[model samples]
Target: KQDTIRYNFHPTHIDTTSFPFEQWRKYFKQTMCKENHRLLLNGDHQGEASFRREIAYYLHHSRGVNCTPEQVVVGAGVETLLQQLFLLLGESKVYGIEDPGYQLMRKLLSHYPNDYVPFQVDEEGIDVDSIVRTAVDVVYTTPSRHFPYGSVLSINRRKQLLHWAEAHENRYIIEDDYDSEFRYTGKTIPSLQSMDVHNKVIYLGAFSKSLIPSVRISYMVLPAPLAHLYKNKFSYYHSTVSRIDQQVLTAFMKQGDFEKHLNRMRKIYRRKLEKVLSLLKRYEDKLLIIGERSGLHIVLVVKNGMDEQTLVEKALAAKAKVYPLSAYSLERAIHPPQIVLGFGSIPEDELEEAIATVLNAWGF
Candidate 1:
């Protein structure tokens, strides 16, 4: 029972209607009348079933600076809250991670039972003096548009990473905002847990990029006395979620249909990212397209001699599926030939025939 396949690329292709399949089948028929219909779990207090995780933390704390709602917390994504933060921060002391970050958070922290620290990304992101000269006490940033290099960490390196995590007082900066609601350009960066006033930030967010990846949600803000010790050490091994997809995500955020499904998936990922940046400027001399000015993937650095793992093994023998930023390295990873293209669920004409069959399967 393990042969379910079929996923070349479909992370975000939509023709209007981001979440309204007849309003999600009429709130899934009022969420199938949930038992006797009173499971809001107001008593057990897993933060009292957190209303769509406090309506996704006051809609990003009303887009300003600080945030609250008991410093947020919801999980089951971002590696199940970074495996409960490597089981409450003891996954071997050295932790930094960010060079071309989130290759499934370096393959889920290399099957964690511990150790990290590998910061050094370019295009102005995650290099706060390599986490203030390896002051590593756990750093992990993706800074909104980075994972697979989309850029945007500068604001003077996001206030020098909250002043180097408040002068390295036992560091801690795991931002990973991961795709700040699809920005094609400017206006939308605010978070380092909103420049953490010395709480040393811990942000992280999800809904697998605006819902629908098995609908597993994610949210976390922490820092209020470590969100009461992560709700008293993982609230009895947690479990709850899907009281009708948290009441259709609190009625998709109290009726705004969750910012109208992030403004209709940011206009279908800005028209499939302007047709993959006009086919990387029409295959600019056998490709070299570096980070498309904002998220949901685009890295392509395979110059003439092309060798990103033999051009992703000739684009997986022409079936297309691409990838290869040295397969998201852990230590020795400084863009060895690069490749990451993921037009978030391929659409604009099947993303121009999957980037022209990955530039003619590498013969470019």
Candidate 2:
């Protein structure tokens, strides 16, 4: 049982923990207050005005969406932004949620303002038929790469969902583009919003995964018509991000440090991923690891008759930790026996040992 060590992924390593010290010194030496004035409360943090939110906006449109910076909204985190979005969008009563989608999204929507409905997911992603039957006005999806499963929503389902939104005059889709940047095997999948020619989609993106989570920022690409209406009602509300942090972040983008940091993390995580996969390969029979193509995580589907809690507890007893898939699903019968292990923060050497520990625990 003590044969393997745990691979830790719960935010142990932090990049940009401290701003680049040398850059800070260089910045102070060369810049003045006039050159770097503190931004206003409601200022575009990253100066998207010059770039016109072009960085993310263009990325959204490149996927075939029609959105811009002004059509974008930013908030401290997904929680903050979702609350404001609920207010801005007038709180549609029944929201459609993927059965095993991000739990945080479900919790956020279940707050004081909005109500929700649940939809089942399979290998192809959220079941479109379940969505139609649920008849929710707004659907929430983690389709780019589901939080725990880490698979793309299938092409057929993407097209079908868009069709559903179009055919149902009262329906809309909310796309939560979580961890879409680190796809390992292929070109990035197009977002559900990209197919919204009729403006039935609301696009949500955050730099949280790509950048530091503590950065406390998430942005939304809104429908043009709704963008104006939301601004009219809520533009006066100030952002929680400070002027100095916003200024530094804008500089981070201007100097291209943001993208550079992402590239570094991408390569680092890719290696960590390979280590995990190799471990899984060595012990292939007892475990079936699913959804390894993209994202900072992977899902391990335990073999039939394998006691998930017992396996997890055994691993834990050996100092290994894993998150159970049932922690998310709405129904007990619907939840599968799986563990959602993350590789993003785990060290290279520890991964194999972590896998070995789980295998040993499972009597492999």
Candidate number of the best lDDT: 2
TM-scores for all predictions = 0.34, 0.84
Residue-by-residue lDDT tens digits, candidate 2, 1-364 = 1133535444223334333557655654554366555433346542335343654544654455667556666667677777776776676567888777777767776566777787767766778888777667887888777666665677888888788888856766788877776775654766667666687678777767676666677767778677778777875676665545554555667676666666676776777767778767866775677774766666677765856777667667767666676667887843347677766555565666666665676675
Candidate 2 wrongly placed segments (more than 4 Å)? 1-7, 10-65, 304-306, 333-336, 361-364
Positional deviation of residue 144's Cα in model 1 after best superposition, in angstroms: 11
On residues 189-256, what C-alpha lDDT tens digit does candidate 1 reach at each position? 66556656667576666676656766777776677667778777767665545454666667657666
User: In candidate 2, where is summed lDDT lowest over 10 consecutive residues?
Assistant: 10-19
Clashing pairs in 1: 10-345, 11-345, 45-48, 96-117
What is the overall TM-score of model 2 with all chains considered together? 0.84
lDDT of 1: 0.63
